[PDB]
């Protein structure tokens, strides 16, 4: 009734649902008694023909299939390269405690980053801005995204559940950064001219073959299997169902499955997983010195890290005993063992 009267769900200015509804009304009125089946079988008819006409509304006005793969590509990060150039530039100027002007600065940086890439749609670029806390210690793991939404697609995206998409969004870019930071401190020791032939390098080196093999496995078999056959049933449901809330709460079961696989356990595993990405983050800042493995501080800082890396594989070992002795969760167990025979074999 707000925007436009020919856009009605039942068919009220534009269709003739109303005369049929009035005939149903005369039939319902003609009854002195009351029961359950006669009242509720025609609660279908005031719902089902109404639940299909708005499905035939929003297909044509919006190109439905357009933005509802676009909004997932901003949050679940389908365009993976197109944000790493943002992450590389936003790292070099989030090296402060956050202030209120850094929101606008990181924003215009994501602007120029997505602009030099040549997106296939120039107006898809300024459809969002980015948002970031007050000043905890650092700008990373405190930033977010605002992708606001137009007419009636917003009834599918309440302002609650974009926080539910944004909260894993800062988590998935955090494992793009620590994957790429482990990809760059690896990239310093590629040649023999930067390599020392000491045994202090060899004890540095079995660790990254254990730790850089993790985030290229743990955050891959999570993130790719989260996307593929959860995107698969959405596209198969909207191509096979002419109904509104059954499509709608099926994408509510979609989002709650993504935020359950990516959460694996509340206190321990999320504390085990962020302890993994902290402990290989100091493997970046240890290697990043000039001629690392020949320094006394290069081996002195290392000795704490050779404890903390097996503090993480053995804590990963502690969850696997809770996965075998199993009354908790099957999707937890199928994923964590999939990386584990990809670990122990």
């Amino acid at each position: 009734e707000n925007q436009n009267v020919n856009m009605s769900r039942t068919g009220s200015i534009l269709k003739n649902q109303e005369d049929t509804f009035a005939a149903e009304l005369h039939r319902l009125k003609q009854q002195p008694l009351f029961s359950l089946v006669d009242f509720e079988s025609v609660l279908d008819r005031i719902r089902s023909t109404v639940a299909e006409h708005l499905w035939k509304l929003m297909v044509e006005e919006s190109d439905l299939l357009g933005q509802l793969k676009i909004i997932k590509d901003f949050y679940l990060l389908g365009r993976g390269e197109l944000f790493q150039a943002f992450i590389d530039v936003a790292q070099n100027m989030l090296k402060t405690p956050p202030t209120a002007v850094t929101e606008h600065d990181v924003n215009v940086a994501f602007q120029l980053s997505a602009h030099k890439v040549l997106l296939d749609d120039d107006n898809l670029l300024p459809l969002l801005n980015l948002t970031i806390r007050e000043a905890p210690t650092s700008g990373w793991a405190a930033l977010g995204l605002s992708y606001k939404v137009q007419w009636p697609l917003h009834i599918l995206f309440t302002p609650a559940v974009l926080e539910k998409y944004n909260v894993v969004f800062k988590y998935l870019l955090s494992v793009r950064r620590v994957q790429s930071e482990l990809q760059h401190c690896w990239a310093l020791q590629m040649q023999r001219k930067h390599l020392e032939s000491n045994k202090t390098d060899a004890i540095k080196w079995r660790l990254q073959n254990h730790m850089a093999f993790l985030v290229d496995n743990l955050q891959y078999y999570l993130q790719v299997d989260v996307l593929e056959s959860q995107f698969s049933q959405l596209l198969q449901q909207i191509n096979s169902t002419r109904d509104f809330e059954s499509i709608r709460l099926a994408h509510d079961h979609f989002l709650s499955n993504l935020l359950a696989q990516s959460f694996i356990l509340l206190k321990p595993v999320f504390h085990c997983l962020n302890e993994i990405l902290e402990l290989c983050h100091s493997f970046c800042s240890l290697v990043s010195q000039n001629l690392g493995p020949l320094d006394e501080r290069g081996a002195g800082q290392l000795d704490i890290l050779v404890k903390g890396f097996s503090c993480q594989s053995s804590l990963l070992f502690r969850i696997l005993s809770s996965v075998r002795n199993h009354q908790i969760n099957p999707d937890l167990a199928q994923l964590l063992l999939r990386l584990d025979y990809n670990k122990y074999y």
Partner: protein
């Protein structure tokens, strides 16, 4: 757009010739023939640029206001006291109101003082123009570092005015006609046209019509007269005057850092362009 926003700049270039007829205030007559020959020469200036018919030329009128410039008697200016008046006619009255013509006088007087800066700043290049005039290409007493601070002065002004010109004109002309027409929402036009004009003064400087940024565009205007009087006429009194400009330009930079808030004022980023330019050198 052609005679208030000045995007066919032949009229505002001819305004510079009208700014080349004042040259300081007040030394102009106070007769009643002073509006009589001065309202004419602006109508004659449109035929001097060979553009437009007389159909829209009835929509332009000029009202010479009266303000003291010797400051006890009157001798009114044409750098900031010459105003174009747009007309209200018989069918077109839902487009033009009295509030929007009040700010047309504000916009026309604000271009007319920045154009007086840029024009008289190039009048000094006419003073030292080559036969030779001023001489001593580098030595004797300074021209090498003299013209070095004068051109980095005329650097900063000529690139400020170009950036203020790009934020006034372009997106406002992109927002205006197209949007209004396509929205087939055309009833009670002055509730939308005045909002368009309120954005058009939002984009200029807007200063909430009260901020001290208007006091700095006056002080940097106050040295350009000091710049032009020393070149018409002193070399030690020169080098102090532009250190005062470099103090006032750095004063203009530090207030911008206080307007900073976030995500706001598309001139503020454009000012922070030059600040991050000022950091790398």
């Amino acid at each position: 757009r052609h005679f208030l926003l000045m995007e066919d700049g032949e009229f505002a270039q001819s305004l510079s010739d009208m700014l080349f007829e004042k040259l300081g205030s007040g030394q102009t007559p106070s007769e009643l023939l002073n509006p009589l020959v001065l309202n004419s020469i602006l109508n004659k200036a449109l035929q001097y640029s060979l553009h437009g018919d007389s159909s829209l030329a009835s929509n332009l009128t000029f009202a010479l206001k009266y303000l003291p410039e010797v400051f006890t008697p009157t001798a009114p200016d044409a750098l900031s006291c010459l105003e174009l008046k747009y007309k209200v006619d018989w069918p077109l009255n839902i487009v033009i109101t009295d509030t929007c013509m009040n700010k047309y006088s504000r916009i026309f007087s604000f271009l007319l003082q920045l154009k007086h800066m840029v024009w008289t700043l190039r009048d000094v290049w006419f003073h030292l123009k080559r036969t030779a005039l001023v001489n001593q290409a580098s030595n004797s007493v300074q021209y090498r570092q003299l013209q070095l601070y004068r051109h980095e002065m005329q650097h900063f002004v000529k690139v400020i005015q170009g950036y203020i010109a790009n934020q006034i004109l372009h997106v406002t002309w992109c927002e205006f006609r197209n949007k209004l027409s396509a929205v087939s929402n055309l009833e009670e036009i002055y509730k939308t046209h005045a909002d368009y004009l309120n954005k058009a003064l939002f984009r200029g400087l807007l200063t909430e019509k009260a901020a001290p940024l208007m006091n700095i565009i006056h002080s940097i205007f106050s040295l350009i007269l000091k710049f032009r009087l020393q070149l018409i006429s002193n070399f030690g009194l020169m080098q102090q005057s532009y250190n005062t400009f470099k103090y006032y330009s750095d004063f203009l930079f530090e207030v911008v850092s206080k307007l900073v808030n976030r995500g706001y004022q598309p001139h503020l980023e454009d000012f922070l362009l030059r600040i991050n330019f000022n950091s790398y050198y």
